[PDB]
Design a protein around this ligand. Structure first.
Ligand SMILES: O=P(O)(O)OC[C@H]1O[C@](O)(COP(=O)(O)O)[C@@H](O)[C@@H]1O
Ligand SMILES: O=P(O)(O)OC[C@H]1O[C@](O)(COP(=O)(O)O)[C@@H](O)[C@@H]1O
Ligand SMILES: O=P(O)(O)OC[C@H]1O[C@](O)(COP(=O)(O)O)[C@@H](O)[C@@H]1O
Ligand SMILES: O=P(O)(O)OC[C@H]1O[C@](O)(COP(=O)(O)O)[C@@H](O)[C@@H]1O
Lengths: 422, 422, 422, 422
């Protein structure tokens, strides 16, 4: 008794919010992938932070490494609501990751070593290593209980995924005790589970270390001159060889409004998945429940007026089907379908928006037809523009993925001669 | 030089947020009129507070007297964002107005006397007496500059209003210097201005006193056994007899996005004006600009998901014309017109909502037709209900004003047998 | 597993901060006993609030009933640091206890009934009834675990106390299962424990109810016309007759830095105990540990400069032995012993302060000798005053208890002709 | 009228908190000079921030460049108390100053260019360039009024200083209109004022630019390949050649409790001045008034218990003369003189501390004699250590300045074999 309440209390979260999101390819070019707008008013890292609140871990480490100003500002404004006198705080740890090191060189692990003295000053018994550019719902206290029950030194959150995409994350092979037998990091030919050939038991980048080991284990890897200083390439394979690595099935701890559904864990890294995962919310029955009161997700909530709908220049009405319209939006006529409008979006008359993601402060000119697109923050689409109808034009002007999703950025439009400053 | 910056610094605001709003007649029965929801996510007193922020008066006194729990909670959550170490705070002063005293007996003024020692502890040179159940935009620093320039002891904000409603507020007659010649409080036959017969120069319940006089002036009225201890009936007529009362034309200080319009000051006290003033925002060109960045109005902003629009049970779309939909709302089909939806309103399919004000957390059942109505907070309208089409039915069930506006409350619906707890 | 973490989450604290502290007899005459300054920078209710934080109960109800302005202001400034979007808040519930009712008439319980609808809106499974004018350290989660393990409907925190003072609190007789056999409220002849004749097993005013019962149980007592609507006189005796009342030995849950000591629970209600409990902190080995990092006690922490020590008018030094000097204090010479100085105390030269409690903003004139006294907040002791040396003089001027403790208030000194406004 | 209130509103502060403080030589080796502890509980940058609050400039830019984690954390905890919805915020701008650039290469100015787009997003009419590693009290609104009255494009705060140290700051020669005639940056032979030979009219690193010029002026210097991108070397000399530079005598705007004193502006950069400026506060009549209520200086105020004084191991008392003891300190006996104790300092028995600055969390062992020293944060001085009595020993072990001041750091003591981790 009195373990699940005294386990978060002794533990500290370390959100590795340094992802470059290179597969968004322009969207995160300007801001860290943890700061990517998602689903109304939220930011991706909020998820990884909210799970730490609702799981009782009120001591978090936000390790900002690349292009991190908006993440710093966002944390400062929204999550600067803790009294540090009662051991509950979001320590924003600038990583200052070595410039000598290239993109993902002096990797994930080298950023948690540079700030090791400050982590030691926390005197935690346990530590929660997290990837803070993912979307999921999880109670980390259930994972800490499952970590202490097994008497392990590292606990990896493992989930079965399709074997056609399992090369993107580390793949493990476990025994009856969920103890790791074999870890392999980004394999070209992922091994399947024994019971399921079409699936692979992949890691989720959610580790739980006992602190005194983690420290003892980082320095050995820090002195190493051959390692990539990466949690998947170097540390977890070593712990697997030692035999002190255990697995945690994510279905045990995922926070689901409805128990019947398949666990929800979206690795947003590619544009087409960002678009899909933003449009899941606009559907008739979303897979991710934002209206869950048992498990609320918090963000920086600014004072916006209600979403205003008005008549077009001709005086007619506007139609909306399966759409999200956040605060500050203004709409005039303009049939909307399957789309998601972030804050302060102005859509003038005669517009047809279908399956679009409009990031904050967009200005859509009159008579615009937008389809299967992602409009970056603070764009100004000119009058008469047409996107998504002719594929070759959209590839020629904007970034069009192989699937058909289009990404419209200020830069692209500036280059087209449509002046943006407004 | 350096007067307008050093004038708010020496002054403290006193918001008289004890209004009963008796002319709403059920709406404020449960909460103080300053806590009445207005226009999306705001509360009326926020206006009187925001004007104090944007006018530099960061020391406010919120004198809560009647049925004041939601106002206390609202202040505690939203406006508890000040560091008192730098002389900037919202002192929530429980008035504890004498029970012996009846409704508006031991009036406006007796509530600012009971807490006089604490007001003296502020050591202010000036004090701003405000009515905190009104809607307006005003820069009080311009009023303090105009107060010091004239060398007065009390400065009353005066505005011309129609003489057919001027009996509701105190009426003054001023000279060329804006110095008060004759004050009269709630006259049955309001005297007209000399230049305009159809108008009367009425007070707005916005006074500015030099503190050392105000104190000296309250005690004399406090020792008095004949007075009503009311700022309009007792104090300001006395100052008018002394000749130390001056007037401030509200057009000089009103904060207007567009200078061409007539000043905006709504005395919400009656239901029909609450409805109109809430529906002005949904119109094509509102008279009150909420999107003004120079003069933002702040409220308690809670984290709500975006306004979700979905398909009805039949799969068809939903139409919105000249409407406001705040955060957390959910709509399925349901043609909406000229209405305003507060937070967390759920409107099921086949509904026709026209010129309605739906306060937070309403649940409208399927196939509801609502017209020219005001639905009180946390109602649950049953399936098939029809309001606003047949006047006699709406008078028989709910409160129907003489104009045609309908007010739907939990109590009324509970009495009809429609069980509300959900 | 996962009970102690999911038990506070479903529970809400109700701090009954309406105590009049009549046995302080002037100290709480001006402010609610929960707002009584204690031990440096803290307020008594902070203890009852901090225990709710460190025990995970982040939903608190502060039921303010009498003379409650400083408590409201204190909560608003200090404990208004919660985001209510994640179910964690201090709901300041004005009780508005019936005036018809006299001092402790329509008692403890009638104040938790008037606000019952709002408590129901919390949808808690459990509720923690607390006395918020006491000093103690306790982990309420251990008490909730012990409450669920026994399968009870009310859990009372019981502690053995001396039988010479056991008439002050309710006395219970329990079985081997800690199930209540016999409850009796403020008996003139308290029954002793069977094993110890010199002690009585008394209640601590810390109850834990399962919510759905509590509601069901308040209304029955609310409809009652014969009850005192008191938790000790009416409700807990009834639950004892039903047989659904269980006891919780406070030694199991008390948070002690050193396990060897006897539990620390001070019922401050009398002046002499307020003085002793404030001087325990100044001793060489305090019984209550404020430097405990595992269990921090939070208060409204204002920005004060360090405690300044300077030379007297003659240039000599100042001596301090077993003393506490909080922020903002200023001392010149002035031998100090066994005393406790609250914020912004100025002690001029040639003063001898021995075993004194100086509340905030005191001004001690030159050549003052103070001994075994309690100086109320914002006093101004004149030059040459002598307290504590001649008992009859101190009884004649100030309030001198039977033990010898002296209480100096502004009123008393105003009456002596020593003008205080400074 | 209504200029001094509408001038801060249109202006934004830019605190250049990237100083390396190389002349402290170990003290700032670990933390940015703006984060250097000063005078009880404050940090140097707090001054530059507090002046912006009390001068109405509630929009600040904290440009963190070097070794900036504690400054980020300090801002996040203390100064994250603003609602950004009402245009009032501390935007923490990571500078990410070019590594290619050496210490003070791509200087002061290049750090305000890299973040130019975000500064433009503020749409300020004026901008306040500040050095955030200095100590002073100033009302910037008086400076903005004096800036608009003269019709200038840059306003430099100028003060006469002694000509024996005037080579450390830029030296100007002005006309009767306070218009700059000749600027020269760090001259080896500073020119004296015409009326005073012993003084030079030096700059204070406090500039006020009209924004649209500043932008226009940075890019020209940014395109330049020959400049040092320094505000003193490059920009202000260019503006002086244009003739659009004006001077602001700092005595007009300094905030002084007593008008008779000489303005207080301490350039802390050297250790001996840090020690003196920290010991000015402990004196009998400090030159800098921290008890000023008109102009409060705010810091991150954590909940600390009062400064505890107790008896030594032998039971004797402790003497304090002209000393500051902040919260959390603990003292046993231990004669103290002319010193300043930061938070959580523990001084065991038999210690003689004279004219010392003990930074937070120091642990002084028994029988220590400390004189004319500066003990760095979180040291642990062993038993019997003697500092300041024999100069050669202190030079051999610790850093001893030419004047006699000693600086004790963890590193130094670690190297001596006194293990520090506690
Ligand atoms: O080319 P620009 O003008 O920087 O525009 C790129 C856009 O990226 C942004 O930096 C994105 O902002 P955030 O990612 O910080 O929310 C916008 O501020 C900006 O308009
Ligand atoms: O009859 P009930 O159940 O009190 O309902 C009346 C309604 O008035 C309210 O008190 C209004 O709330 P606020 O005015 O505090 O926003 C609701 O909480 C409540 O549902
Ligand atoms: O007789 P007075 O002037 O009210 O003085 C009584 C004292 O009691 C106090 O109200 C006590 O204050 P708190 O109890 O609110 O801390 C002081 O403000 C006041 O000086
Ligand atoms: O050699 P170490 O262990 O880093 O110690 C150096 C000291 O400098 C510090 O970083 C100074 O802290 P701050 O400057 O952040 O207040 C201490 O945390 C630390 O103890």
């Amino acid at each position: 008794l009195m373990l699940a309440r005294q386990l978060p209390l002794k533990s500290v979260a370390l959100i590795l919010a340094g992802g470059r999101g290179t597969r968004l390819k322009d969207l995160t070019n300007k801001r860290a992938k943890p700061a990517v707008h998602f689903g109304g008013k939220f930011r991706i890292i909020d998820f990884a932070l909210s799970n730490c609140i609702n799981s009782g871990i009120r001591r978090m480490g936000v390790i900002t490494q690349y292009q991190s100003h908006t993440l710093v500002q966002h944390i400062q404004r929204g999550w600067s609501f803790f009294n540090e006198e009662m051991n509950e705080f979001v320590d924003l740890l600038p990583a200052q990751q070595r410039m000598k090191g290239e993109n993902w060189y002096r990797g994930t692990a080298d950023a948690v070593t540079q700030n090791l003295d400050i982590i030691r000053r926390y005197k935690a018994e346990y530590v929660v290593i997290l990837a803070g550019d993912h979307i999921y719902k999880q109670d980390y206290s259930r994972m800490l209980i499952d970590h202490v029950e097994k008497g392990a030194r590292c606990t990896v959150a493992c989930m079965p995924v399709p074997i056609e995409e399992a090369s993107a994350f580390g793949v493990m092979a476990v025994d009856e005790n969920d103890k790791i037998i074999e870890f392999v990091e980004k394999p070209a030919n992922p091994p399947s589970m024994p019971n399921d050939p079409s699936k692979s038991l992949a890691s989720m980048g959610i580790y739980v270390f006992d602190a005194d080991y983690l420290y003892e284990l980082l320095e050995e890897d820090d002195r190493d001159e051959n390692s990539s200083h990466d949690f998947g390439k170097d540390l977890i394979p070593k712990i697997t060889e030692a035999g002190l690595a255990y697995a945690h099935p994510f279905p045990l701890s995922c926070v689901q409004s409805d128990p019947d559904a398949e666990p929800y864990w979206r690795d947003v890294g590619t544009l087409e998945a960002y678009w899909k995962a933003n449009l899941d919310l606009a559907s008739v029955v979303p897979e991710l429940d934002m209206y869950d009161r048992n498990w609320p997700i918090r963000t920086y909530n600014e004072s916006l007026p209600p979403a205003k709908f008005v008549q077009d220049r001709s005086g007619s009405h506007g139609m909306t089907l399966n759409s999200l319209v956040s605060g500050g939006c203004v709409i005039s006529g303009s049939v909307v379908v399957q789309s998601v409008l972030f804050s302060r979006v102005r859509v003038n008359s005669f517009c047809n928006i279908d399956s679009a993601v409009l990031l904050p402060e967009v200005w859509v000119g009159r008579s615009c037809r937008l389809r299967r697109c992602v409009i970056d923050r603070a764009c100004v689409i000119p009058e008469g523009m047409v996107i998504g109808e002719n594929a070759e034009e959209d590839a020629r002007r904007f970034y069009r993925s192989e699937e058909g999703i289009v990404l419209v950025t200020r830069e692209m439009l500036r280059k087209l001669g449509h002046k943006q400053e407004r």
